[PDB]
């Protein structure tokens, strides 16, 4: 129910495949606290945090879903934590794949109907619709996404 345990739980199925070595989750947490990215969507969704580690072997996105908001650390320097229903985590190796994936994510998050569906839809369906969006773009080739990386979170 906190961002530290959610990040560890979320990273676990991705570390299991060797996508990233050296545990990674502790670095993801330290990275998010030192410099948050923009979080509040025009609607009810929340933007995807990223780590840009240098021990990442390939690119991948973990998604999952929360039932209750966990008041994930805010971004704008104001006393405004941003309630998050869906916590995401992406991996990357260099600046260029982070910029490309974040721009794609930007395009995905402004689709409000998709995010509400993410809030109520099943896990097989979450996998299917995000996979479809990743493979639709001419960009994002090579980013790994599989059913094992989408799980319910506490």
């Amino acid at each position, epitope marked *: 129910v906190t961002q530290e345990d959610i990040i560890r739980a979320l990273a676990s199925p991705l570390i299991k495949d060797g996508m990233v070595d050296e545990d990674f989750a502790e670095y993801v947490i330290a990275r998010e606290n030192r*410099s948050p*990215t*923009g979080l509040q969507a025009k609607g009810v969704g929340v*933007a995807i945090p990223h780590t840009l*580690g240098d021990y990442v072997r390939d690119n991948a996105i973990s998604v999952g879903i929360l039932d209750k908001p966990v008041n994930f650390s805010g*971004w704008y320097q104001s006393p405004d934590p941003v309630p998050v229903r869906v916590v995401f985590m992406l991996a990357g190796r260099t600046w260029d794949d982070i910029v490309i994936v974040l721009k794609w994510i930007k395009d995905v998050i402004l689709d409000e109907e998709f995010m509400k569906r993410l809030l109520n839809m099943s896990d097989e369906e979450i996998y299917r619709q995000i996979y479809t969006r990743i493979s639709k773009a001419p960009n994002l080739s090579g980013i790994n996404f599989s059913r094992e990386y989408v799980r319910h979170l506490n």
Partner: antibody, heavy 130, light 108 residues
Framework: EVQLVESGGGLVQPGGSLRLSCAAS????????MSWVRQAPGKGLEWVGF??????????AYAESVKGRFTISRDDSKNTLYLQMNSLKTEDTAVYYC?????????????????????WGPGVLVTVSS | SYEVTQPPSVSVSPGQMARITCGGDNLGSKYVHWYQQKPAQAPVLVIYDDSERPSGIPERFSGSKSGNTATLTISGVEAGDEADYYCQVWDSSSDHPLFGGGTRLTVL
């Protein structure tokens, strides 16, 4: 015009404080962003600290081993960047510069880039009177 | 990334075509910007990301940086334009840019 002018230098004893600032005009301050760089004698481009543009939240950061003693802020109505220096030490006497980067780091914006510093001014010399 | 290596100085003949570099763990990715400082002046940018130039910059500072070491490549020194240069490494592993490397030049 275009060229920035650093001000606020002088002779300050260890343990004291001083407000340093850098002036800008002839262009929009907010369409570029300012951070602090130090040049101690014999060295060059030492990082002092960094703040983000208000567009990206105004997040503050510090260079390693200079946490706290260097407080970095801005005044966007005067196109002026300033740093409040405290806990001064003799080994930190140097010429201070305000570096102008070109970029943003967030969602619903884009403009992702590296700092890519371009042009800045002669800097202000900060030494100990002794 | 992290510490940036350099020689204290390099002696450059008009035709030496010196390959003067900034070190680090890997500069073939996570590239650097280069700055040139005239004595008693602040440094200014000499070259942009990878290989691109501000207007007014000569054919020098044209290195392709094909390896993991960033090579500026100076095809000699013209007239009074000898000046110190340095580089900027963003160093994403710390989220904030570090600066380093750089050489002072001499002639004759």
């Amino acid at each position: 015009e275009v060229q920035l002018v650093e001000s606020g230098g002088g002779l300050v004893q260890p343990g004291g404080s001083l407000r340093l600032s850098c002036a800008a005009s002839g262009f929009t301050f907010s369409n570029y962003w300012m951070s602090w760089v130090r040049q101690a004698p014999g060295k060059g481009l030492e990082w002092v600290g960094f703040i983000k543009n208000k567009a990206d939240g105004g997040t503050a950061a510090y260079a390693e081993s200079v946490k706290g003693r260097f407080t970095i802020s801005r005044d966007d109505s005067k196109n002026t960047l300033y740093l409040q220096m405290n806990s001064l030490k003799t080994e930190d006497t140097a010429v201070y510069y305000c570096a102008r980067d070109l970029g943003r780091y967030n969602f619903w914006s884009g403009f992702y880039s590296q700092n890519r510093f371009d042009v800045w001014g002669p800097g202000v010399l900060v030494t100990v009177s002794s | 990334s992290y510490e940036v290596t350099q020689p204290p100085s390099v002696s450059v003949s008009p035709g030496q075509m010196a390959r003067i570099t900034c070190g680090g763990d890997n500069l073939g990715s996570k590239y650097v910007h280069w700055y040139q400082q005239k004595p008693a002046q602040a440094p200014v940018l000499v070259i942009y990301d990878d290989s691109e130039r501000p207007s007014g910059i000569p054919e020098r500072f044209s290195g392709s940086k094909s390896g993991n070491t960033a090579t500026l490549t100076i095809s000699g020194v013209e007239a009074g334009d000898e000046a110190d240069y340095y580089c900027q490494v963003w160093d994403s592993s710390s989220d904030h840019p570090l600066f380093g490397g750089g050489t002072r030049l001499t002639v004759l």
